C-alpha cells in the first residue's frame, strides 16, 4: 500500500510494555517527538492490551501526518533504525482503514 499519510511502525513494542500508564505515555511521546522531526503529527494510535488480550493491531504503532510527503519522509527517516534495540519495520496504512480505526 501507499504512499499514504498514515505510517505503521512494527517491531517496536512488547504488549507487556503497554500495560503501565506511565510507560505507555513515555512510549507515545518518544514516538511523537521523533516523528515530529519530519512533519506535523495529527494523531498517534498505539493499541493496548485489554482484559489481558492482544487486541487487533496490538504490537503496532500508527502515526498520521498532515501530508503524504511528510509521512514518506518519516518512513525514510525511521525505517531500519533501532528502537529499544529492535529493528523498526514500516508500512503505509490506508487512511480509510485508519479513518475507521480498523487495525489488524
Amino acid at each position: 500500500l501507499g504512499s499514504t499519510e498514515v505510517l505503521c511502525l512494527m517491531n517496536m513494542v512488547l504488549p507487556e510494555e503497554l500495560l503501565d500508564d506511565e510507560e505507555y505515555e513515555e512510549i507515545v511521546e518518544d514516538v511523537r517527538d521523533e516523528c515530529s522531526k519530519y512533519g506535523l503529527v495529527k494523531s498517534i494510535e498505539i493499541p493496548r492490551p485489554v482484559d489481558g488480550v492482544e487486541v487487533p493491531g496490538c504490537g503496532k504503532i500508527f502515526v498520521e501526518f498532515t501530508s503524504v510527503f511528510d509521512c514518506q519522509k518519516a518512513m525514510q527517516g525511521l525505517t531500519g533504525r533501532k528502537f529499544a534495540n529492535r529493528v523498526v519495520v514500516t508500512k503505509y496504512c490506508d487512511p480509510d482503514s485508519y479513518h475507521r480505526r480498523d487495525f489488524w
Binding site: 512510549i27 518518544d30 521523533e34 525514510q76 527517516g77 525505517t79 533504525r81 528502537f83 529499544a84
Partner: peptide, 12 residues
C-alpha cells in the same frame, strides 16, 4: 532518554 538510536537510516 529516548529509546531511539542516534544512527541515521542511511547508515544502517
Amino acid at each position: 532518554k529516548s529509546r531511539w538510536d542516534e544512527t541515521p537510516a542511511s547508515q544502517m
